[PDB]
Structure 1
Amino acid sequence: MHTLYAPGGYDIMGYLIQIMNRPNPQVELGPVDTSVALILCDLKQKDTPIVYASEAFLYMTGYSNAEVLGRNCRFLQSPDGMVKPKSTRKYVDSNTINTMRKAIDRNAEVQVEVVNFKKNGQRFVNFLTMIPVRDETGEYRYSMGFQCE
């Protein structure tokens, strides 16, 4: 991976407002702010890399910014943080992974429960919600994910 990051950073607040104001929500999220566990991934870079992670997400997972930025979030699916693309997970429901994959590919909102592992290997069930986000061009460019232990 050789992910690039927006100089100036990301409009996380604007995107949260965009999400809460979206016209046809397929999943209710309730109010959200920058204090919750969240991450932003770039749909237009190789393998949809994490380009922003909230402090609550880092705290929840036990990983640092340096350890999560630039990677696809699937690494949480293994206690050793080693998950190759297209691989058959050995601790995660395959249908669940396919559900996430198809939704992200179609810019469709999705909510699932997925088995994840913290840096120290602690297993937990992550209640995940992913909502596509439009940038200044008005087209879907990012995906904002919300995590819940």
Structure 2
Amino acid sequence: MHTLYAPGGYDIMGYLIQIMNRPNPQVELGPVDTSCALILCDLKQKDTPIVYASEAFLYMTGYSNAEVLGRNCRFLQSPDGMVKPKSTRKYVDSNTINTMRKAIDRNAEVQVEVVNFKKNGQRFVNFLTMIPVRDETGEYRYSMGFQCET
């Protein structure tokens, strides 16, 4: 992967405001800000890479900024952070992973519980929410994920 990052960063705050103000929410999130564990992935770049991760996300997973950026979030699904696309995970529910995948392909809001692993190998249940986000052009370009341990 050779993910590129938007020079000048991302309008995280503008996207959080966009999400809280969306007209027909399929999932209720309640108020949110940059304090939770969250990430933004680029839907238009190869294998939907992470182009931003809040500090709470790094704190929750144990990985640093350098270790997460430019990677598809699926690496958390393995205690060794090694998960090849299309692979049959041995520690994660296949239907769960397929649900996330179809929701993303369709720009449809989804919410699931997925088994994840921290950098030190510690297993936990991630209560994950993904919401598609429109950029300045008005079309879906990114996806915002909200991660919660338990």
TM range (shorter): over 0.9
CA displacement, residues 61-87 of structure 1 (integer Å, 9 cap, x when unaligned): 000000000000000000000000000
SS in 2 for 1:41: strand
2:29 is matched with 29
CA distance in 2, matches of 1:55, 1:121: 19
CA distance in 1, matches of 2:127, 2:114: 7
1:39 is matched with 39
CA distance in 2, matches of 1:35, 1:112: 21
Q: Which runs of 5+ in 2 are unaligned?
A: none
CA shift, 1:120, in A, is 0.1
CA shift, 1:116, in A, is 0.0
TM-score by length of 1: 1.00
CA shift, 1:108, in A, is 0.0
Corresponding pairs, count: 149
SS in 2 for 1:119: coil
Q: Which runs of 5+ in 1 are unaligned?
A: none
SS in 2 for 1:96: helix
CA distance in 1, matches of 2:76, 2:34: 21
CA distance in 2, matches of 1:144, 1:132: 6
CA distance in 1, matches of 2:63, 2:23: 35
CA distance in 2, matches of 1:147, 1:49: 16
Please tell me whether residue 73 in structure 1 is matched to residue 76 in structure 2.
no
Percentage of identical aligned residues: 99
CA shift, 1:57, in A, is 0.2
User: Runs of at least 4 residues of structure 1 off by over 4 A?
Assistant: none
Q: Over the residues paired in the alignment, what is the CA RMSD in angstroms?
A: 0.2
CA displacement, residues 46-103 of structure 1 (integer Å, 9 cap, x when unaligned): 0000000000000000000000000000000000000000000000000000000000
